[PDB]
Amino acid sequence: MKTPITEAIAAADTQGRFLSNTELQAVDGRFKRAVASMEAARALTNNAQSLIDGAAQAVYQKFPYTTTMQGSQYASTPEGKAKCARDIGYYLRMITYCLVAGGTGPMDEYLIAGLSEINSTFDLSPSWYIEALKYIKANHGLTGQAAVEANAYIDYAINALS
């Protein structure tokens, strides 16, 4: 999985050499950055439920048809809603993973890879998620670096949905 530390190893291993200083300096930057990030991760995880639910609704407001239109890809029913409640959980759960790892790696491997085909196949609409996401960005009550880091990965999840 791609993380600052593993990229460094990957580089060194490619040229069959031990680790450089430059590389070492890189991991240190990652450790330094890891503080406010573990903080963002902890915060968001503790607010898990309210952000999910608060996110769920916000997507039934910007896109009302999802709550009415019949069809398995719609939240118009319970199991429909269950699914969407599950997906924002997955989205939320992913950001904190990136936060803990110091990179988009987690999100890349577990969500980003294959995102298109899957949205296209199940008739899922990006809008719905960029929406739930946009709500998370302005509802995590994070400040300073914790918010800087957090937001970075969120936007990444958006461009990836474009």
């Binding site: 999985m1 530390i5 593993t6 190893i9 060194a12 291993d13 069959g16 680790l19 070492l24 902890r42």
Partner: protein, 172 residues
């Protein structure tokens, strides 16, 4: 590959759960203890040559049969080869020291290593000896109190030893 952090995320994703406080506490002591990890790698890495060198001497010293006519280390090609392996192993170990995980060592270095040697006739046991010796040597260096800010390195050294042992146990 996996690093200490990616490892924990792996285990959580597999249950689709967020990290538990205890998990967050673990990943945060790693970061705190960061600097110490860096010194270990930087130190082991910087002395790789002498680390390998001495282990070899020790090895052939206890096992002269390997450098007889035909033992497996006989002839510069084969001897050269052995030296390279000791370094390959070492190099992967340091990678593991920095990752806080042995995935990179296990995957790119240790797996199938036992079969490889067997096919070749190369005695695993002996390779394990050469590893067990680089271990003591490397831990003397990493954990040397001279020229470094005082503090407890025990946890880390224990981990570093873990890796080496893991390797010797994968070829013996």
């Amino acid at each position: 590959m996996l690093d200490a952090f990616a490892k924990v995320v792996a285990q959580a994703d597999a249950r689709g759960e967020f990290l538990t406080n205890a998990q967050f506490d673990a990943l945060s002591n790693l970061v705190k203890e960061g600097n110490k990890r860096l010194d270990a790698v930087n130190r082991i890495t910087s002395n790789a040559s002498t680390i390998v060198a001495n282990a070899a001497r020790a090895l052939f010293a206890e096992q002269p049969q390997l450098i007889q006519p035909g033992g497996n280390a006989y002839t510069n090609r084969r001897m050269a080869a052995c030296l390279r392996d000791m370094e390959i192993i070492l190099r992967y170990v340091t990678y593991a020291i920095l990752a806080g995980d042995s995935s990179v060592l296990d995957d790119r270095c240790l797996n199938g290593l036992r079969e490889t040697y067997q096919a070749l006739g190369t005695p695993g046991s002996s390779v394990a000896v050469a590893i067990q010796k680089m271990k003591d040597a490397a831990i003397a260096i990493a954990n040397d109190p001279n020229g470094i800010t005082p503090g407890d390195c025990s946890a880390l050294m224990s981990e570093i030893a873990g890796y080496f042992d893991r390797a010797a146990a994968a070829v013996a």
